Amino acid sequence: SMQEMTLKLGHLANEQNAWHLAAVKFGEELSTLTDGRIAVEVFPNESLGKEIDLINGMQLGTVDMTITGESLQNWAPMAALLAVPYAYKSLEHMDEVASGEIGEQIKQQIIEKAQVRPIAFFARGPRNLTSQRPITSPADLDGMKMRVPNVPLFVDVWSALGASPTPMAFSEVFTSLQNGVIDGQENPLALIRSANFNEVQGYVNQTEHVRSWIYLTIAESTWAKLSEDDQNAVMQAAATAQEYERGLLLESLAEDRGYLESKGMTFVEVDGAAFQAAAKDAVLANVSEEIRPIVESLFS
Ligand SMILES: O=C(O)[C@@H](O)[C@@H](O)[C@H](O)[C@H](O)CO
């Protein structure tokens, strides 16, 4: 019937990735729930803008939605808790934290300090370090140039481990690797696949150094303009999308390693104890006082 608005939703994954399918599902559900009054347009591959630029856009009123996680720590320090190295044990553990009182505090700080509102969370597979030569322990890094996302805690940890990390937008990584500006990066298998890093990296080192969740978010200024009924529809659509997305994540766990191996990547077993000990020390040396007690709890 009527179409009142179109929400623009940007993310960094490609069209086969769980996040994209979930974003599309969110849009379908929201359209149904609002009789088409609210449409969603999904922009994959950072085509709407790079993550940090989208967060700024949401604050300014030019972007409606994005999928964002621990890069929010640049505004809301508690958001670093989404992705503390070696802190979370499993999907079930992260679900408990993200949905519990600590998760509520994180959500509220993101709303207040970043002016974006989490409406769903997606748990992720573990991040792994990719490289041009095998990296079996921190001692192998030896100053290796690598990319991290715009996450100060990751700069701190990877520098302490012996690498030379540089923050960069996700969509810049492939070309930077191709051109030899960096030799490695780190991400879950789903994103290594999404961005075709198999074409520019030889090794997946099984560091499994971060298990994290990420948020589907809406600009607080967009949320504020919605009627209570439409707010409810947004939440309902997001919950449906979250349930759907978890299934897609689980499917990806069964397939992505095999896929990447079929594209020539070599998976490398690491000295997990050495990585974990060095990374936990680095986290504790660099963690904000605000979240230190929670991190110590997780590490206990
Ligand atoms: O490497 C990346 O850019 C991605 O994995 C992001 O999802 C990243 O985790 C961001 O920091 C999330 O806010």
Curated annotation (Swiss-Prot):
Source organism, top-level taxon: Bacteria
InterPro entries the record matches: DctP_fam, TRAP_DctP, TRAP_DctP_sf
Cell compartment(s), UniProt: Periplasm
Chain positions recorded as L-galactonate binding sites: 51, 69-71, 124-127, 147, 187
GO terms, biological process: transmembrane transport
Pfam family, one: DctP
UniProt keywords, alphabetically: Periplasm, Signal, Sugar transport, Transport
Keyword Ubl conjugation: no
UniProt binding sites for D-mannonate: 51, 69-71, 124-127, 147, 187
GO cellular component: outer membrane-bounded periplasmic space
Family matches, as PANTHER family: PTHR33376, SIALIC ACID-BINDING PERIPLASMIC PROTEIN SIAP
Assigned protein family: Belongs to the bacterial solute-binding protein 7 family.
Role this protein plays: Solute-binding protein that binds L-galactonate and D-mannonate (in vitro). Probably part of a tripartite ATP-independent periplasmic (TRAP) transport system that mediates solute transport into the cytoplasm.
NCBIfam families on file: dctP, TRAP_S1
Assembly mode: The complex is comprised of an extracytoplasmic solute-binding protein and a heteromeric permease formed by two transmembrane proteins.
Protein name: Solute-binding protein RD1_1052
Organism: Roseobacter denitrificans (strain ATCC 33942 / OCh 114) (Erythrobacter sp. (strain OCh 114))
